Amino acid sequence: KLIANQFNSAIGKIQDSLSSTPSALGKLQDVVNHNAQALNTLVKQLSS
Amino acid sequence: KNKCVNFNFNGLKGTGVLTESNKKFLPFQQFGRDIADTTDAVRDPQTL
Known part of the structure; x- marks a missing residue:
């Protein structure tokens, strides 16, 4: 009883x-944060 | 409007589907954009 x-x-x-x-x-x-950040930096690299 | 058409607004040649925008453009503002440096909105070089 006491264990329960x-x-x-x-x-x-x-x-x-x-x-x-x-x-x-x-x-x-x-x-999730790492995947998102990689995605955003990949996107931003286009404007270079 | 509402067609994947080749637009050439004041030289800004491109292809996409043109639709009405609810963007609160200020009177001076001419071109729209987004997060990823993409002009999602445009002002008519003709009747506003």
Whole structure:
């Protein structure tokens, strides 16, 4: 019973940890930012 | 209008589909542009 209670408490705390403002999902955002930045610089190189 | 046509507005020769623009052109402003250094809008060298 107490093991299940601890597990449920940890699972619930996971939700507030994720939903809180300081997102730790910078890894996935980094890839998208790199791809976008490469695309923009490739576009801007045309005007040279 | 509304056709992929060869336009030659005051020498600015090019091909594209011409459509009405809602751009808030100021009276002095003549040529439009975009992020990627592309003239997306033009002012008539005839009746405005």
